[PDB]
Amino acid sequence: GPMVHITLDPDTANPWLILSEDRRQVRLGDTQQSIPGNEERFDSYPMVLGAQHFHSGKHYWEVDVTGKEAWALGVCRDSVRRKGHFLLSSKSGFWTIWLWNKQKYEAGTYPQTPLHLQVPPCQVGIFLDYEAGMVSFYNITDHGSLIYSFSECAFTGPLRPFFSPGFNDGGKNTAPLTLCPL
Ligand SMILES: CC(=O)c1ccc2c(c1)N(CCCN(C)C)c1ccccc1S2
């Protein structure tokens, strides 16, 4: 079935992130870690990928976001640029939604799409359908209602799970993103 056990890829993790020993959780740090400047590491935002690669098929996983004032989740091409600033956009190889400022939910279309959520999600489900060209986001707290779906994605190559526990703000928002047991 589509449920997949995601683990986080340490080689991609921005130095402002702290990964748990089992690589199932990630949070913002108060200072940057001193770690290699390898080509796969996001250097400008607190972002990290899952280790898993998807070339085809249906895949599903869930993330706990309880109480966080900001986070971003989704899928991206493995080929996305890792160094420098960029637009989180489905024109740039990312299919993502996010929260910031405690109550501003947006989908990473270009331009961005505001999302009106009646129930703030505590857990989010991410469903990837490679052949259908779809990435769908579900509000587990609201009985699995649809938050947003990207369609007509027309994927090539491997895709990766994408995560951010927030941006750097002054040590705020330090609770982790946690991959839920499935
Ligand atoms: C849209 C875009 O390219 C974009 C690029 C990077 C980031 C981002 C938006 N925001 C949303 C804006 C935060 N700014 C205003 C500080 C975000 C949200 C949750 C977690 C991490 C991040 S960092």
UniProtKB/Swiss-Prot annotation:
Give the tissue specificity: Isoform 1 and isoform 2 are expressed in fetal and adult heart and fetal lung.
| Keywords tagged on the record | Cell cycle, Coiled coil, Cytoplasm, Cytoplasmic vesicle, DNA-binding, Host-virus interaction, Metal-binding, Nucleus, Phosphoprotein, Ribonucleoprotein, RNA-binding, Transferase, Ubl conjugation, Ubl conjugation pathway, Zinc, Zinc-finger
Keyword Nucleus assigned to the entry: answer is yes
Location relative to the cell: Cytoplasm; Cytoplasmic vesicle, Autophagosome; Nucleus; Cytoplasm, P-body
One GO cellular component term of this record is:
cytoplasmic stress granule
Give the GO biological process terms.
antiviral innate immune response; cellular response to chemical stress; innate immune response; negative regulation of innate immune response; negative regulation of NF-kappaB transcription factor activity; negative regulation of protein deubiquitination; negative regulation of viral transcription; positive regulation of autophagy
Main localization category = cytoplasm
**Origin, by domain of life?**
Eukaryota
The conditions that induce or repress this protein are given as: Up-regulated by isoform 2 of XBP1. Up-regulated by IFNG/interferon-gamma, with a peak after 2-4 hours of treatment in monocytes/macrophages.
**Start and end of every B30.2/SPRY domain?**
4-182
Entry annotated with the keyword Isomerase: no
Q: Describe the PTM.
A: Autoubiquitinated; does not lead to its proteasomal degradation. Deubiquitinated by USP4; leading to its stabilization.
User: One MF term from GO for this chain?
Assistant: zinc ion binding
Give the domain note. The coiled-coil is necessary for the cytoplasmic localization.
Q: Per its database record, what is this protein's job?
A: E3 ubiquitin-protein ligase whose activity is dependent on E2 enzymes, UBE2D1, UBE2D2, UBE2E1 and UBE2E2. Forms a ubiquitin ligase complex in cooperation with the E2 UBE2D2 that is used not only for the ubiquitination of USP4 and IKBKB but also for its self-ubiquitination. Component of cullin-RING-based SCF (SKP1-CUL1-F-box protein) E3 ubiquitin-protein ligase complexes such as SCF(SKP2)-like complexes. A TRIM21-containing SCF(SKP2)-like complex is shown to mediate ubiquitination of CDKN1B ('Thr-187' phosphorylated-form), thereby promoting its degradation by the proteasome.
Provide the assembly information: Homotrimer. Interacts (via C-terminus) with IRF8 (via C-terminus). Component of a SCF(SKP2)-like complex containing CUL1, SKP1, TRIM21 and SKP2. Interacts with CALR, CUL1, FBXW11, HSPA5, IKBKB, IRF3, SKP1 and VCP. Interacts with SKP2; the interaction with SKP2 does not depend on an intact F-box domain. Interacts (via N-terminus and C-terminus) with DCP2 (via N-terminus and C-terminus). Interacts with ULK1, BECN1 and with ATG8 family members, including GABARAP, GABARAPL1, GABARAPL2 and MAP1LC3C/LC3C. Interacts with TRIM21 and SQSTM1/sequestosome 1. Interacts with IRF3. (Microbial infection) Interacts (via B30.2/SPRY domain) with severe fever with thrombocytopenia syndrome virus (SFTSV) NSs; this interaction activates NFE2L2-mediated transcriptional activation of antioxidant genes.
What family name appears in the similarity comment?
A: Belongs to the TRIM/RBCC family.
The name under which this protein is listed is E3 ubiquitin-protein ligase TRIM21
- Designated gene of the protein: TRIM21
Q: Which residues of the full protein are shown?
A: 287 to 465 of 475
